Write an enzyme that holds these catalytic residues in place. Sequence first.
Site, mmCIF file in Angstrom:
data_model
loop_
_atom_site.group_PDB
_atom_site.id
_atom_site.type_symbol
_atom_site.label_atom_id
_atom_site.label_comp_id
_atom_site.label_asym_id
_atom_site.label_seq_id
_atom_site.Cartn_x
_atom_site.Cartn_y
_atom_site.Cartn_z
ATOM 1 N N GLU A 274 0.712 -1.187 0.005
ATOM 2 C CA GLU A 274 0.044 -0.031 0.163
ATOM 3 C C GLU A 274 0.832 1.117 0.029
ATOM 4 O OE1 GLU A 274 -3.444 -0.197 -0.055
ATOM 5 O OE2 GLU A 274 -3.861 -2.226 0.820
ATOM 6 N N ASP B 108 -8.238 4.928 -4.865
ATOM 7 C CA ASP B 108 -7.283 3.608 -4.819
ATOM 8 C C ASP B 108 -7.993 2.915 -6.219
ATOM 9 O OD1 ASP B 108 -10.167 2.581 -4.300
ATOM 10 O OD2 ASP B 108 -9.212 0.782 -3.048
ATOM 11 N N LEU C 158 -8.898 3.071 3.820
ATOM 12 C CA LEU C 158 -10.236 3.721 3.037
ATOM 13 C C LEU C 158 -11.040 4.629 3.896
ATOM 14 C CD1 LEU C 158 -12.389 2.970 0.809
ATOM 15 C CD2 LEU C 158 -13.146 1.465 2.235
ATOM 16 N N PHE D 186 -7.659 -6.589 4.680
ATOM 17 C CA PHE D 186 -6.997 -5.419 4.851
ATOM 18 C C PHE D 186 -7.622 -4.534 3.491
ATOM 19 C CE2 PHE D 186 -4.326 -2.136 6.973
ATOM 20 C CZ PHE D 186 -4.049 -1.504 5.869
ATOM 21 N N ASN E 274 -7.806 -19.033 -9.102
ATOM 22 C CA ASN E 274 -9.400 -18.781 -8.849
ATOM 23 C C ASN E 274 -9.231 -17.159 -8.356
ATOM 24 O OD1 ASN E 274 -12.128 -20.999 -8.451
ATOM 25 N ND2 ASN E 274 -9.924 -21.481 -9.485
#
EC number: 3.2.1.17
Length: 162
Positions: free
Chosen positions: A11, A20, A32, A104, A132
């Site tokens: 990050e 973002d 966020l 997170f 996946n």
Amino acid sequence: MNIFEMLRIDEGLRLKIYKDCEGYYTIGIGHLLTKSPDLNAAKSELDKAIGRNCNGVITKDEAEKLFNQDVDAAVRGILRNAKLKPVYDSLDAVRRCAAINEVFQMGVTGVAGFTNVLRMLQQKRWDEAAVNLAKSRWYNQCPDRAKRVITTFRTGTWDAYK
Ligand SMILES: [Ca+2]
Ligand SMILES: [Cl-]
Ligand SMILES: [Cl-]
């Protein structure tokens, strides 16, 4: 290497409000602020998170305070979720870091919906899970934030951050 260093790589730091990879308003080390399309709401969200008029810009110490809080929230989010906890608790140490990392970034709700991946992870089917996750909306939009995490789930080593 540990979850904090891992997320600091993924990050980074940002001391001004950015949108973002998901298109939402963020600051610090992936904190966020809101999913609202309104900047001024995220601007007030920052003030409320810190306890002062910021106002869109924070310091490095404050960013690290938010970071500890957010990592704590992610762990608690996992442990409180009936879908996530048993899968989590089946994981080895390193993959548990990948799991904290994904929650997170994406949040508990997003992650808990990946029902088949959770099954594949609980049964230690690392290859299929990786594949996946690679075809997820998370990965396709945030490939640089997501890439090392998928690889970590596959290998259970820290080599992707080395
Ligand atoms: Ca643990
Ligand atoms: Cl640390
Ligand atoms: Cl990214």
